[PDB]
Amino acid sequence: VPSQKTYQGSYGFRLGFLHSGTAKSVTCTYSPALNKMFCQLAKTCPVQLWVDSTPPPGTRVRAMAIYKQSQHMTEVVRRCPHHERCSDSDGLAPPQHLIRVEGNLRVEYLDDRNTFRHSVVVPYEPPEVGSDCTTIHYNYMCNSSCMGGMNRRPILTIITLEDSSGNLLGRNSFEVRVCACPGRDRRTEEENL
Amino acid sequence: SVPSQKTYQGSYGFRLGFLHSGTAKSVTCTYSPALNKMFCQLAKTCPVQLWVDSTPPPGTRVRAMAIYKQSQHMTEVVRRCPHHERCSDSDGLAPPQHLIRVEGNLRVEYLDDRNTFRHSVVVPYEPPEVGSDCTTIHYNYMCNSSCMGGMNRRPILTIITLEDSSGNLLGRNSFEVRVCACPGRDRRTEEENL
Ligand SMILES: O=C(O)/C=C1\SC(=O)NC1=O
Ligand SMILES: [Zn+2]
Ligand SMILES: [Zn+2]
């Protein structure tokens, strides 16, 4: 099982999210209380990288999904047979991969040769001049409710900062529900608190 | 074997809807929300609504299949009685043995499962028509619930499955059906017992 241990490391690495609220219109919304992203199938999911100091040249940013529950943790998170077969290809992402990056031609996809785990990795870019974080646009290409895939099992996304050799510089994670109405679903889930 | 009747809204938030038709003597098809049961007349239009949270892709298909509701009858294939099988009511498309037809759709496809021998009818999924928030399929039930040598008063379920162009299951819903002479009266009577 991949480690989900939070690690700010030398560069003070943590994640940020847009403060989007729970209006019906929202495409993507993050719950601080639940540490949970609510997002729509194949829609922009902004994830912010915050550092106290610039990581070195060739630093990379990897995203990987795991099942949150102990009893499912060893099962590779992948798209359902249906979504794997859909003609929704961007010409870059493998059809089995849940997590894509949109708007980055330097994106790289891995099928791990030992663990069979899927991940997507981009070069780390510092913030645009006058900005305090780096934004990556993730797309989740299966719904949480898909039979043959996640089938309502909650997942975590693990974001790792690595050097050009793959050495760990930093790690953070958040729960993800891919759903039709993130706004309503977030508000409903926070009601139970 | 027995086809699954387990409700599955799945990726597209798939639910069934029915017209709020009431129980006047003139109604040909009326649904009881309390019983989740359709009452309809032999060979008459039965609107079944498909509700989705998101539009399934092109090539999506919608399948209807009848199974007996009671455990002791579940393994028996639901088919028309000898009399109705021999009625000259053919539309050129539906096999004469099939209980469930679709009317007004030249893209309708009928299956005799080579392994289970189960009957099903499938149509292309189309997005909701103008003035509607759902997709309506017009089903016809071609044998009465009371028919001796067929269902013979045994209650049936219709299972509606949403599948992609490759036959992957996207969603499943079901409802009980009674095919009868006076659906309105029979709905009132069966709701009285609540
Ligand atoms: O046409 C026939 O000879 C038999 C049929 S047609 C129909 O709907 N009901 C009947 O008893
Ligand atoms: Zn899926
Ligand atoms: Zn009959």
mmCIF file of C-alpha atoms and ligand atoms in Angstrom:
data_model
loop_
_atom_site.group_PDB
_atom_site.id
_atom_site.type_symbol
_atom_site.label_atom_id
_atom_site.label_comp_id
_atom_site.label_asym_id
_atom_site.label_seq_id
_atom_site.Cartn_x
_atom_site.Cartn_y
_atom_site.Cartn_z
ATOM 1 C CA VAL A 1 0.000 0.000 0.000
ATOM 2 C CA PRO A 2 1.327 3.511 -0.867
ATOM 3 C CA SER A 3 2.075 5.750 2.206
ATOM 4 C CA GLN A 4 -0.481 8.569 2.935
ATOM 5 C CA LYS A 5 1.716 10.053 5.771
ATOM 6 C CA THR A 6 1.627 13.913 5.603
ATOM 7 C CA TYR A 7 5.187 15.277 5.029
ATOM 8 C CA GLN A 8 5.816 19.057 4.654
ATOM 9 C CA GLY A 9 9.577 18.300 4.232
ATOM 10 C CA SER A 10 12.393 20.861 3.658
ATOM 11 C CA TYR A 11 10.295 23.168 1.371
ATOM 12 C CA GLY A 12 7.185 23.502 3.656
ATOM 13 C CA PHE A 13 4.922 21.674 1.151
ATOM 14 C CA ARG A 14 1.125 21.632 1.741
ATOM 15 C CA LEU A 15 -2.080 21.714 -0.385
ATOM 16 C CA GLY A 16 -4.649 24.510 -0.797
ATOM 17 C CA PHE A 17 -8.145 24.535 -2.377
ATOM 18 C CA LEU A 18 -10.506 27.280 -3.683
ATOM 19 C CA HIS A 19 -13.028 28.514 -1.027
ATOM 20 C CA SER A 20 -15.882 27.778 -3.497
ATOM 21 C CA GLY A 21 -18.842 27.217 -1.078
ATOM 22 C CA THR A 22 -21.833 24.877 -1.697
ATOM 23 C CA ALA A 23 -24.084 26.785 -4.208
ATOM 24 C CA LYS A 24 -25.845 24.346 -6.668
ATOM 25 C CA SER A 25 -23.762 25.869 -9.565
ATOM 26 C CA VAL A 26 -20.288 24.872 -8.137
ATOM 27 C CA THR A 27 -18.376 22.332 -10.342
ATOM 28 C CA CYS A 28 -15.829 21.537 -7.536
ATOM 29 C CA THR A 29 -15.830 22.298 -3.731
ATOM 30 C CA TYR A 30 -13.481 21.269 -0.861
ATOM 31 C CA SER A 31 -14.675 20.518 2.733
ATOM 32 C CA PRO A 32 -12.008 21.556 5.304
ATOM 33 C CA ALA A 33 -13.955 19.693 8.090
ATOM 34 C CA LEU A 34 -13.898 16.377 6.085
ATOM 35 C CA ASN A 35 -10.594 17.097 4.190
ATOM 36 C CA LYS A 36 -12.754 16.057 1.192
ATOM 37 C CA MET A 37 -12.925 17.339 -2.431
ATOM 38 C CA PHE A 38 -16.414 17.065 -4.063
ATOM 39 C CA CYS A 39 -16.050 17.298 -7.905
ATOM 40 C CA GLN A 40 -17.870 16.431 -11.197
ATOM 41 C CA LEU A 41 -16.780 13.722 -13.727
ATOM 42 C CA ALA A 42 -14.104 15.072 -16.174
ATOM 43 C CA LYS A 43 -14.482 18.708 -14.864
ATOM 44 C CA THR A 44 -11.612 21.014 -13.714
ATOM 45 C CA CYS A 45 -10.553 20.186 -10.090
ATOM 46 C CA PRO A 46 -8.029 22.899 -9.025
ATOM 47 C CA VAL A 47 -5.419 21.659 -6.471
ATOM 48 C CA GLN A 48 -2.967 24.281 -5.074
ATOM 49 C CA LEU A 49 0.683 23.518 -4.127
ATOM 50 C CA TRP A 50 1.987 25.837 -1.317
ATOM 51 C CA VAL A 51 5.768 25.861 -0.429
ATOM 52 C CA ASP A 52 7.757 28.146 1.983
ATOM 53 C CA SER A 53 10.823 27.827 -0.380
ATOM 54 C CA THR A 54 11.215 26.940 -4.119
ATOM 55 C CA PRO A 55 11.905 23.207 -4.711
ATOM 56 C CA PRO A 56 15.019 22.528 -6.870
ATOM 57 C CA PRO A 57 15.092 22.218 -10.705
ATOM 58 C CA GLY A 58 13.479 19.020 -12.142
ATOM 59 C CA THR A 59 11.127 18.607 -9.092
ATOM 60 C CA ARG A 60 7.965 16.624 -10.082
ATOM 61 C CA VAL A 61 4.357 16.471 -8.733
ATOM 62 C CA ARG A 62 2.645 13.019 -8.703
ATOM 63 C CA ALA A 63 -1.074 12.234 -8.050
ATOM 64 C CA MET A 64 -2.278 8.682 -7.124
ATOM 65 C CA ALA A 65 -5.697 7.395 -5.894
ATOM 66 C CA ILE A 66 -6.004 4.642 -3.211
ATOM 67 C CA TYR A 67 -9.151 3.190 -1.525
ATOM 68 C CA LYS A 68 -9.593 4.867 1.926
ATOM 69 C CA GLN A 69 -10.941 1.679 3.685
ATOM 70 C CA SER A 70 -8.380 -0.906 5.013
ATOM 71 C CA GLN A 71 -10.349 -3.825 3.412
ATOM 72 C CA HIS A 72 -10.002 -2.264 -0.134
ATOM 73 C CA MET A 73 -6.515 -0.602 0.227
ATOM 74 C CA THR A 74 -4.565 -3.281 -1.814
ATOM 75 C CA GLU A 75 -7.020 -2.992 -4.812
ATOM 76 C CA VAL A 76 -5.666 -0.685 -7.614
ATOM 77 C CA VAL A 77 -8.071 2.290 -8.160
ATOM 78 C CA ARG A 78 -8.999 2.243 -11.906
ATOM 79 C CA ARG A 79 -11.921 3.333 -14.159
ATOM 80 C CA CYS A 80 -14.971 0.992 -14.513
ATOM 81 C CA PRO A 81 -15.132 -1.116 -17.737
ATOM 82 C CA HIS A 82 -17.646 1.472 -19.186
ATOM 83 C CA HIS A 83 -15.485 4.643 -18.686
ATOM 84 C CA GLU A 84 -12.326 2.690 -19.776
ATOM 85 C CA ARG A 85 -14.184 2.023 -23.123
ATOM 86 C CA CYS A 86 -15.645 5.601 -23.534
ATOM 87 C CA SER A 87 -14.205 7.746 -26.422
ATOM 88 C CA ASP A 88 -13.231 10.576 -23.959
ATOM 89 C CA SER A 89 -9.419 10.278 -24.671
ATOM 90 C CA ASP A 90 -7.249 13.484 -24.648
ATOM 91 C CA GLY A 91 -4.484 11.575 -26.568
ATOM 92 C CA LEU A 92 -2.175 11.523 -23.469
ATOM 93 C CA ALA A 93 -3.894 9.676 -20.528
ATOM 94 C CA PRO A 94 -4.142 5.846 -20.493
ATOM 95 C CA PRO A 95 -7.853 4.859 -20.777
ATOM 96 C CA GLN A 96 -7.777 2.916 -17.396
ATOM 97 C CA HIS A 97 -6.437 5.936 -15.360
ATOM 98 C CA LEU A 98 -8.921 7.707 -12.992
ATOM 99 C CA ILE A 99 -6.777 10.890 -12.530
ATOM 100 C CA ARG A 100 -5.738 13.077 -15.515
ATOM 101 C CA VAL A 101 -4.101 16.538 -15.652
ATOM 102 C CA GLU A 102 -5.763 18.975 -18.145
ATOM 103 C CA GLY A 103 -3.892 21.893 -19.840
ATOM 104 C CA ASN A 104 -0.295 20.522 -19.447
ATOM 105 C CA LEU A 105 1.506 18.948 -22.507
ATOM 106 C CA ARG A 106 4.443 17.855 -20.206
ATOM 107 C CA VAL A 107 2.128 15.441 -18.239
ATOM 108 C CA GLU A 108 3.460 11.847 -17.778
ATOM 109 C CA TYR A 109 1.382 8.704 -16.889
ATOM 110 C CA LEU A 110 2.797 5.607 -15.087
ATOM 111 C CA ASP A 111 1.573 1.999 -14.739
ATOM 112 C CA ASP A 112 3.924 0.879 -11.879
ATOM 113 C CA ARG A 113 5.813 -2.276 -13.070
ATOM 114 C CA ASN A 114 5.758 -3.842 -9.512
ATOM 115 C CA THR A 115 2.535 -2.473 -7.816
ATOM 116 C CA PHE A 116 0.381 -1.984 -11.033
ATOM 117 C CA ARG A 117 -0.670 1.389 -9.454
ATOM 118 C CA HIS A 118 -1.665 4.271 -11.803
ATOM 119 C CA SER A 119 -0.194 7.774 -11.276
ATOM 120 C CA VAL A 120 0.049 11.061 -13.229
ATOM 121 C CA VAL A 121 3.082 13.371 -12.829
ATOM 122 C CA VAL A 122 3.867 16.925 -14.085
ATOM 123 C CA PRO A 123 7.004 19.098 -13.730
ATOM 124 C CA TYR A 124 6.768 21.344 -10.612
ATOM 125 C CA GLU A 125 6.371 25.017 -11.699
ATOM 126 C CA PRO A 126 6.821 27.874 -9.180
ATOM 127 C CA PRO A 127 3.784 30.191 -8.749
ATOM 128 C CA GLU A 128 3.144 32.782 -11.530
ATOM 129 C CA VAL A 129 4.838 36.089 -10.457
ATOM 130 C CA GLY A 130 2.668 37.815 -7.762
ATOM 131 C CA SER A 131 0.839 34.517 -6.843
ATOM 132 C CA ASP A 132 1.463 32.469 -3.631
ATOM 133 C CA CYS A 133 0.702 28.904 -4.966
ATOM 134 C CA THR A 134 0.973 26.577 -8.025
ATOM 135 C CA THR A 135 -2.437 25.347 -9.355
ATOM 136 C CA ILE A 136 -2.757 21.933 -11.109
ATOM 137 C CA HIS A 137 -6.062 21.168 -12.950
ATOM 138 C CA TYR A 138 -6.960 17.507 -12.191
ATOM 139 C CA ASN A 139 -9.840 15.646 -13.944
ATOM 140 C CA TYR A 140 -11.469 12.562 -12.282
ATOM 141 C CA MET A 141 -12.693 10.327 -15.149
ATOM 142 C CA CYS A 142 -15.052 7.974 -13.155
ATOM 143 C CA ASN A 143 -17.930 8.724 -10.687
ATOM 144 C CA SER A 144 -17.749 7.395 -7.063
ATOM 145 C CA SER A 145 -21.064 5.506 -7.817
ATOM 146 C CA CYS A 146 -19.702 3.630 -10.957
ATOM 147 C CA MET A 147 -20.327 -0.199 -10.740
ATOM 148 C CA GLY A 148 -17.253 -2.189 -11.905
ATOM 149 C CA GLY A 149 -15.000 0.665 -10.651
ATOM 150 C CA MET A 150 -14.953 2.495 -7.265
ATOM 151 C CA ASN A 151 -18.618 1.357 -6.730
ATOM 152 C CA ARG A 152 -19.303 3.922 -3.890
ATOM 153 C CA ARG A 153 -16.007 3.080 -2.041
ATOM 154 C CA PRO A 154 -14.320 6.320 -0.837
ATOM 155 C CA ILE A 155 -10.813 7.064 -2.287
ATOM 156 C CA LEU A 156 -7.907 9.329 -1.188
ATOM 157 C CA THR A 157 -5.758 11.294 -3.676
ATOM 158 C CA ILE A 158 -2.063 11.340 -2.522
ATOM 159 C CA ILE A 159 -0.014 14.322 -3.891
ATOM 160 C CA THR A 160 3.786 13.735 -3.671
ATOM 161 C CA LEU A 161 6.582 16.252 -4.401
ATOM 162 C CA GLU A 162 9.629 14.251 -5.701
ATOM 163 C CA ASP A 163 13.091 15.309 -6.983
ATOM 164 C CA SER A 164 14.206 14.416 -10.588
ATOM 165 C CA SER A 165 15.382 10.945 -9.271
ATOM 166 C CA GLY A 166 11.973 10.148 -7.613
ATOM 167 C CA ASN A 167 13.199 10.833 -4.010
ATOM 168 C CA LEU A 168 10.320 11.975 -1.683
ATOM 169 C CA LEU A 169 10.390 15.790 -0.948
ATOM 170 C CA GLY A 170 6.805 16.127 0.408
ATOM 171 C CA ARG A 171 3.388 14.410 0.628
ATOM 172 C CA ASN A 172 -0.258 15.421 1.331
ATOM 173 C CA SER A 173 -3.672 13.749 0.730
ATOM 174 C CA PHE A 174 -7.433 14.478 0.552
ATOM 175 C CA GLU A 175 -10.588 12.312 0.242
ATOM 176 C CA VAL A 176 -12.435 12.682 -3.126
ATOM 177 C CA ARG A 177 -16.110 12.116 -4.021
ATOM 178 C CA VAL A 178 -16.775 12.398 -7.802
ATOM 179 C CA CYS A 179 -20.543 13.245 -7.973
ATOM 180 C CA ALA A 180 -23.199 15.137 -10.030
ATOM 181 C CA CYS A 181 -23.860 17.968 -7.453
ATOM 182 C CA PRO A 182 -20.699 18.635 -5.353
ATOM 183 C CA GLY A 183 -22.357 21.687 -3.676
ATOM 184 C CA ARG A 184 -25.478 19.784 -2.434
ATOM 185 C CA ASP A 185 -23.409 16.615 -1.602
ATOM 186 C CA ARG A 186 -20.839 18.613 0.498
ATOM 187 C CA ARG A 187 -23.610 20.510 2.402
ATOM 188 C CA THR A 188 -25.501 17.186 3.044
ATOM 189 C CA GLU A 189 -22.277 15.428 4.296
ATOM 190 C CA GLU A 190 -21.367 18.372 6.662
ATOM 191 C CA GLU A 191 -24.995 18.333 8.068
ATOM 192 C CA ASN A 192 -24.151 14.920 9.709
ATOM 193 C CA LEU A 193 -21.347 16.678 11.760
ATOM 194 C CA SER B 1 -30.228 -18.557 -12.906
ATOM 195 C CA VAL B 2 -32.164 -15.297 -12.070
ATOM 196 C CA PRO B 3 -31.343 -11.829 -13.530
ATOM 197 C CA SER B 4 -30.495 -9.261 -10.761
ATOM 198 C CA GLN B 5 -33.371 -6.851 -9.824
ATOM 199 C CA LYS B 6 -31.032 -4.816 -7.494
ATOM 200 C CA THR B 7 -31.644 -1.020 -7.887
ATOM 201 C CA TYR B 8 -28.440 0.699 -9.154
ATOM 202 C CA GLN B 9 -28.590 4.480 -9.985
ATOM 203 C CA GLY B 10 -24.878 4.302 -11.042
ATOM 204 C CA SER B 11 -22.753 6.979 -12.802
ATOM 205 C CA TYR B 12 -25.676 8.832 -14.530
ATOM 206 C CA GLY B 13 -28.068 8.931 -11.491
ATOM 207 C CA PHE B 14 -30.574 6.610 -13.280
ATOM 208 C CA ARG B 15 -34.164 6.570 -11.854
ATOM 209 C CA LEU B 16 -37.592 5.640 -13.327
ATOM 210 C CA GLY B 17 -40.575 8.038 -13.430
ATOM 211 C CA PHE B 18 -44.256 7.527 -14.385
ATOM 212 C CA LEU B 19 -47.003 9.998 -15.475
ATOM 213 C CA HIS B 20 -49.283 11.108 -12.552
ATOM 214 C CA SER B 21 -52.230 9.608 -14.555
ATOM 215 C CA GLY B 22 -54.743 8.986 -11.689
ATOM 216 C CA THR B 23 -57.316 6.126 -11.701
ATOM 217 C CA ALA B 24 -60.267 7.326 -13.912
ATOM 218 C CA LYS B 25 -61.943 4.397 -15.825
ATOM 219 C CA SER B 26 -60.476 5.775 -19.151
ATOM 220 C CA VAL B 27 -56.765 5.443 -18.011
ATOM 221 C CA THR B 28 -54.828 2.747 -19.997
ATOM 222 C CA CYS B 29 -51.705 2.917 -17.686
ATOM 223 C CA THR B 30 -51.486 4.126 -14.026
ATOM 224 C CA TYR B 31 -48.564 3.812 -11.553
ATOM 225 C CA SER B 32 -48.937 3.428 -7.729
ATOM 226 C CA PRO B 33 -46.030 5.212 -5.947
ATOM 227 C CA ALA B 34 -47.134 3.440 -2.678
ATOM 228 C CA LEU B 35 -46.860 -0.086 -4.260
ATOM 229 C CA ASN B 36 -44.160 0.782 -6.918
ATOM 230 C CA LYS B 37 -46.581 -1.050 -9.254
ATOM 231 C CA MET B 38 -47.811 -0.241 -12.806
ATOM 232 C CA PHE B 39 -51.432 -1.197 -13.690
ATOM 233 C CA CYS B 40 -52.011 -1.257 -17.493
ATOM 234 C CA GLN B 41 -54.339 -2.606 -20.227
ATOM 235 C CA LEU B 42 -53.355 -5.370 -22.722
ATOM 236 C CA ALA B 43 -51.456 -3.948 -25.764
ATOM 237 C CA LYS B 44 -52.008 -0.255 -24.667
ATOM 238 C CA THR B 45 -49.357 2.554 -24.402
ATOM 239 C CA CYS B 46 -47.356 2.376 -21.102
ATOM 240 C CA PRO B 47 -45.087 5.455 -20.724
ATOM 241 C CA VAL B 48 -41.950 4.663 -18.616
ATOM 242 C CA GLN B 49 -39.750 7.755 -17.927
ATOM 243 C CA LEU B 50 -35.903 7.589 -17.713
ATOM 244 C CA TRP B 51 -34.454 10.258 -15.312
ATOM 245 C CA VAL B 52 -30.634 10.910 -15.284
ATOM 246 C CA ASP B 53 -28.426 13.452 -13.372
ATOM 247 C CA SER B 54 -26.048 13.480 -16.435
ATOM 248 C CA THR B 55 -26.540 12.547 -20.150
ATOM 249 C CA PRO B 56 -25.273 9.008 -20.989
ATOM 250 C CA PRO B 57 -22.964 8.994 -24.074
ATOM 251 C CA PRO B 58 -24.118 8.184 -27.656
ATOM 252 C CA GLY B 59 -24.814 4.436 -28.279
ATOM 253 C CA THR B 60 -26.314 3.945 -24.748
ATOM 254 C CA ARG B 61 -29.150 1.321 -24.798
ATOM 255 C CA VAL B 62 -32.256 0.722 -22.582
ATOM 256 C CA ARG B 63 -33.402 -2.913 -21.966
ATOM 257 C CA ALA B 64 -36.734 -4.127 -20.448
ATOM 258 C CA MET B 65 -37.184 -7.720 -19.098
ATOM 259 C CA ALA B 66 -40.078 -9.346 -17.129
ATOM 260 C CA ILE B 67 -39.354 -11.799 -14.224
ATOM 261 C CA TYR B 68 -41.859 -13.471 -11.802
ATOM 262 C CA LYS B 69 -41.877 -11.574 -8.439
ATOM 263 C CA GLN B 70 -42.304 -14.692 -6.175
ATOM 264 C CA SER B 71 -39.179 -16.797 -5.257
ATOM 265 C CA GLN B 72 -40.822 -20.153 -6.273
ATOM 266 C CA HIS B 73 -41.500 -18.830 -9.869
ATOM 267 C CA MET B 74 -38.329 -16.679 -10.433
ATOM 268 C CA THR B 75 -36.449 -19.321 -12.569
ATOM 269 C CA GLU B 76 -39.455 -19.626 -14.998
ATOM 270 C CA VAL B 77 -39.142 -17.486 -18.215
ATOM 271 C CA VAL B 78 -42.002 -14.894 -18.462
ATOM 272 C CA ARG B 79 -43.728 -15.416 -21.882
ATOM 273 C CA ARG B 80 -47.193 -14.931 -23.494
ATOM 274 C CA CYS B 81 -49.903 -17.651 -23.077
ATOM 275 C CA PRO B 82 -50.543 -19.987 -26.077
ATOM 276 C CA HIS B 83 -53.733 -17.993 -27.057
ATOM 277 C CA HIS B 84 -51.961 -14.560 -27.182
ATOM 278 C CA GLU B 85 -48.842 -16.097 -28.891
ATOM 279 C CA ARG B 86 -51.275 -17.219 -31.696
ATOM 280 C CA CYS B 87 -53.179 -13.828 -31.882
ATOM 281 C CA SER B 88 -52.608 -12.020 -35.272
ATOM 282 C CA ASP B 89 -51.233 -8.860 -33.510
ATOM 283 C CA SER B 90 -47.655 -8.981 -35.004
ATOM 284 C CA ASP B 91 -45.875 -5.619 -35.728
ATOM 285 C CA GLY B 92 -43.280 -7.490 -37.908
ATOM 286 C CA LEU B 93 -40.499 -6.834 -35.297
ATOM 287 C CA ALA B 94 -41.510 -8.407 -31.917
ATOM 288 C CA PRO B 95 -41.273 -12.220 -31.567
ATOM 289 C CA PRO B 96 -44.830 -13.556 -30.924
ATOM 290 C CA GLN B 97 -43.716 -15.145 -27.556
ATOM 291 C CA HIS B 98 -42.474 -11.777 -26.080
ATOM 292 C CA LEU B 99 -44.681 -10.203 -23.321
ATOM 293 C CA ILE B 100 -43.017 -6.711 -23.537
ATOM 294 C CA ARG B 101 -42.854 -4.689 -26.811
ATOM 295 C CA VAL B 102 -41.821 -1.054 -27.560
ATOM 296 C CA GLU B 103 -44.267 0.898 -29.828
ATOM 297 C CA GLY B 104 -43.281 3.792 -32.185
ATOM 298 C CA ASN B 105 -39.516 2.939 -32.415
ATOM 299 C CA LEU B 106 -38.124 1.375 -35.665
ATOM 300 C CA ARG B 107 -34.697 0.892 -33.897
ATOM 301 C CA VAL B 108 -36.269 -1.616 -31.389
ATOM 302 C CA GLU B 109 -34.229 -4.856 -30.900
ATOM 303 C CA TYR B 110 -35.545 -8.151 -29.369
ATOM 304 C CA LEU B 111 -33.347 -10.793 -27.616
ATOM 305 C CA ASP B 112 -33.920 -14.487 -26.864
ATOM 306 C CA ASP B 113 -30.872 -14.999 -24.540
ATOM 307 C CA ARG B 114 -28.997 -18.034 -26.044
ATOM 308 C CA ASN B 115 -28.077 -19.288 -22.486
ATOM 309 C CA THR B 116 -30.975 -18.201 -20.124
ATOM 310 C CA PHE B 117 -33.782 -18.224 -22.831
ATOM 311 C CA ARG B 118 -35.015 -14.918 -21.200
ATOM 312 C CA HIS B 119 -36.888 -12.379 -23.428
ATOM 313 C CA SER B 120 -35.843 -8.683 -23.468
ATOM 314 C CA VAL B 121 -36.521 -5.614 -25.683
ATOM 315 C CA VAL B 122 -33.859 -2.859 -26.084
ATOM 316 C CA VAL B 123 -33.947 0.636 -27.719
ATOM 317 C CA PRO B 124 -31.287 3.336 -28.237
ATOM 318 C CA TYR B 125 -31.222 5.874 -25.352
ATOM 319 C CA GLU B 126 -32.190 9.379 -26.643
ATOM 320 C CA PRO B 127 -31.783 12.507 -24.435
ATOM 321 C CA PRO B 128 -34.993 14.137 -23.061
ATOM 322 C CA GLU B 129 -37.316 15.467 -25.851
ATOM 323 C CA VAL B 130 -38.386 19.169 -26.105
ATOM 324 C CA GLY B 131 -40.677 20.236 -23.196
ATOM 325 C CA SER B 132 -39.595 17.250 -20.980
ATOM 326 C CA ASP B 133 -36.841 16.669 -18.330
ATOM 327 C CA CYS B 134 -36.868 12.847 -18.953
ATOM 328 C CA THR B 135 -36.785 10.244 -21.782
ATOM 329 C CA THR B 136 -40.128 8.395 -22.323
ATOM 330 C CA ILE B 137 -40.295 4.831 -23.773
ATOM 331 C CA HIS B 138 -43.780 3.540 -24.816
ATOM 332 C CA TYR B 139 -44.002 -0.128 -23.635
ATOM 333 C CA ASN B 140 -46.868 -2.546 -24.577
ATOM 334 C CA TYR B 141 -47.671 -5.649 -22.414
ATOM 335 C CA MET B 142 -49.145 -8.290 -24.790
ATOM 336 C CA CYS B 143 -50.704 -10.763 -22.250
ATOM 337 C CA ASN B 144 -52.987 -10.252 -19.169
ATOM 338 C CA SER B 145 -51.740 -11.115 -15.601
ATOM 339 C CA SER B 146 -54.826 -13.464 -15.323
ATOM 340 C CA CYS B 147 -54.002 -15.397 -18.581
ATOM 341 C CA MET B 148 -54.227 -19.190 -17.909
ATOM 342 C CA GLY B 149 -51.192 -21.013 -19.450
ATOM 343 C CA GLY B 150 -49.094 -17.816 -19.030
ATOM 344 C CA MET B 151 -48.570 -15.611 -15.907
ATOM 345 C CA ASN B 152 -51.856 -17.112 -14.502
ATOM 346 C CA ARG B 153 -52.298 -14.384 -11.766
ATOM 347 C CA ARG B 154 -48.579 -14.639 -10.691
ATOM 348 C CA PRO B 155 -47.180 -11.096 -10.150
ATOM 349 C CA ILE B 156 -44.222 -9.960 -12.375
ATOM 350 C CA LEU B 157 -41.504 -7.258 -12.165
ATOM 351 C CA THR B 158 -40.203 -5.275 -15.171
ATOM 352 C CA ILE B 159 -36.404 -4.661 -14.853
ATOM 353 C CA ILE B 160 -35.140 -1.592 -16.828
ATOM 354 C CA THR B 161 -31.319 -1.619 -17.365
ATOM 355 C CA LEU B 162 -29.203 1.212 -18.876
ATOM 356 C CA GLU B 163 -26.191 -0.286 -20.795
ATOM 357 C CA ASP B 164 -23.410 1.310 -22.937
ATOM 358 C CA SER B 165 -22.821 0.310 -26.625
ATOM 359 C CA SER B 166 -20.486 -2.544 -25.374
ATOM 360 C CA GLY B 167 -23.147 -4.044 -23.009
ATOM 361 C CA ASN B 168 -21.585 -2.726 -19.735
ATOM 362 C CA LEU B 169 -24.255 -2.224 -16.976
ATOM 363 C CA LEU B 170 -24.674 1.556 -16.186
ATOM 364 C CA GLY B 171 -27.905 1.444 -14.097
ATOM 365 C CA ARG B 172 -30.868 -0.745 -13.006
ATOM 366 C CA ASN B 173 -34.417 -0.032 -11.695
ATOM 367 C CA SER B 174 -37.601 -2.176 -11.406
ATOM 368 C CA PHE B 175 -41.391 -1.945 -10.854
ATOM 369 C CA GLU B 176 -44.195 -4.526 -10.352
ATOM 370 C CA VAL B 177 -46.731 -4.765 -13.259
ATOM 371 C CA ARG B 178 -50.370 -5.940 -13.416
ATOM 372 C CA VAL B 179 -51.837 -6.244 -16.977
ATOM 373 C CA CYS B 180 -55.652 -6.040 -16.448
ATOM 374 C CA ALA B 181 -59.004 -4.819 -17.933
ATOM 375 C CA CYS B 182 -59.515 -1.899 -15.421
ATOM 376 C CA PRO B 183 -56.105 -0.585 -14.197
ATOM 377 C CA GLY B 184 -57.702 2.391 -12.311
ATOM 378 C CA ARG B 185 -60.098 0.218 -10.208
ATOM 379 C CA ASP B 186 -57.348 -2.437 -9.594
ATOM 380 C CA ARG B 187 -54.850 0.250 -8.364
ATOM 381 C CA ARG B 188 -57.542 1.675 -5.959
ATOM 382 C CA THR B 189 -58.392 -1.896 -4.707
ATOM 383 C CA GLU B 190 -54.690 -2.908 -4.135
ATOM 384 C CA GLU B 191 -53.980 0.460 -2.339
ATOM 385 C CA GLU B 192 -57.117 -0.078 -0.117
ATOM 386 C CA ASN B 193 -55.256 -3.101 1.446
ATOM 387 C CA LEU B 194 -52.559 -0.658 2.817
HETATM 388 O O1 LIG C 1 -56.464 -11.461 -32.058
HETATM 389 C C1 LIG C 1 -56.662 -12.606 -31.383
HETATM 390 O O2 LIG C 1 -57.157 -13.535 -31.971
HETATM 391 C C2 LIG C 1 -56.289 -12.785 -29.918
HETATM 392 C C3 LIG C 1 -56.065 -11.459 -29.128
HETATM 393 S S1 LIG C 1 -55.505 -9.833 -29.744
HETATM 394 C C4 LIG C 1 -55.571 -9.216 -28.071
HETATM 395 O O3 LIG C 1 -55.103 -8.160 -27.689
HETATM 396 N N1 LIG C 1 -56.330 -10.055 -27.343
HETATM 397 C C5 LIG C 1 -56.751 -11.173 -27.799
HETATM 398 O O4 LIG C 1 -57.530 -12.042 -27.133
HETATM 399 ZN ZN ZN C 2 -16.860 4.775 -14.350
HETATM 400 ZN ZN ZN C 3 -52.410 -14.250 -22.620
#
